């Protein structure tokens, strides 16, 4: 738009085009990668043996 609409707080509205364009859009982050279950994150140490 020549004059993109903004909220009362002057926030540029996130259109449906935006929700599928950027990384936060549901095209790259959601598809190319998942919040995979059976996952455990913890500090690692050297097991030299």
């Amino acid at each position: 738009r020549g004059q993109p609409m903004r909220d009362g707080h002057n926030k540029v509205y996130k259109s449906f085009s935006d929700v599928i364009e950027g990384k936060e859009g549901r095209f790259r982050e959601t598809l190319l990668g998942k919040r995979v279950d059976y996952s455990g994150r913890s500090v690692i140490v050297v097991g030299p043996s």
């Binding site: 995979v36 059976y38 500090v43 690692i44």
Partner: protein, 49 residues
């Protein structure tokens, strides 16, 4: 590149028997010793070794 000044890994457990098959037969460290970039070993002793 697991430095020991701090690192956290994500661990996933294959569930399907097909996934467990290819995890054991394709992704194990004893079958991936040559880097595909040029065909040179990756698990070369380094540091105090």
């Amino acid at each position: 590149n697991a430095d020991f000044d701090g690192d956290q890994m994500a661990v996933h457990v294959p569930l399907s028997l097909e996934a467990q098959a290819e995890a054991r037969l394709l992704m194990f460290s004893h079958m991936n010793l040559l880097s595909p970039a040029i065909g040179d070993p990756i698990s070369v002793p380094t540091q105090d070794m």
